[PDB]
């Protein structure tokens, strides 16, 4: 497991509560940053699907932070992990795409809540994001065999 503190969860929960006021705009900013860095990713999404996908990234990472605090591990149901993993595989999503998305997510948060930004805030989001991404792949691995 990992030790993910009440303070770390509160950073994620509290910044998301502030950013939620502008969730549609923030979702667009996230994808604008992703597509600025790696425009080739735009082809995967050839917009209401972009809106839903950005919201999934934010809300699913938030829920991963809550599960890390509560359980030391990500506890998403297997059908949800299996869906994300199969869809990502189908579309050719590889590690670099997750890495660019993480980078863009953290930049987006930093600009959305400059008054809360700090190394601790960055690391709390990043840890929750990384554990969700790893959890999808561990579920896809349980099914590769
Ligand atoms: C932790 C990070 C991510 C989470 C939580 C996440 C979540 C999701 C979910 C819930 C879906 C299903 C949408 C549906 O069934 O309609 C989905 C689909 C998809 N994801 Fe992700 N995703 C992540 C990362 C990525 C990344 C890094 C890429 C590529 C840069 C990507 C590209 C796609 C595409 C192309 C689809 C299918 C089209 C769409 O639903 O818009 N995803 N993702």
Residue numbers in the entry: 6 to 51, 63 to 161
What did the published study say regarding this structure?
After purification, the two phytoglobins, WT and Cys86Ala, were successfully crystallized. The conditions for crystallization differed slightly, indicating minor differences in the surface properties of the two proteins. The monomers in the dimers showed antiparallel orientation, with the heme groups at the opposite ends of the dimers. In the elucidated WT protein, the distance between the conserved cysteine and the heme iron was 17.3 Å. This can in a first glance be viewed as remote. However, it is well within the 19 Å distance limit that enables electron transfer on ms timescale. When the active center of BvPgb was investigated in more detail, one Tyr residue close to the heme group could easily be identified in position 115, with a distance of 9.24 Å from the heme iron. Therefore, it is plausible that these two residues, Tyr 115 and Cys 86, are both involved in maintaining the redox stability of the iron. Undoubtedly, the conserved cysteine present has a protective role against autoxidation and may be involved in direct electron transfer from the heme iron, affecting the oxidation state.
Phytoglobins (Pgbs) are plant-originating heme proteins of the globin superfamily with varying degrees of hexacoordination. Pgbs have a conserved cysteine residue, the role of which is poorly understood. Class 1 Pgbs are distinguished by a weak hexacoordination (KH ≈ 2) compared to Class 2 Pgbs (KH ≈ 100). Due to the very high O2 avidity of Class 1 Pgbs, these proteins generate a tight and slow binding of O2 well suited for O2-dependent nitric oxide (NO) scavenging in low O2-containing environments.
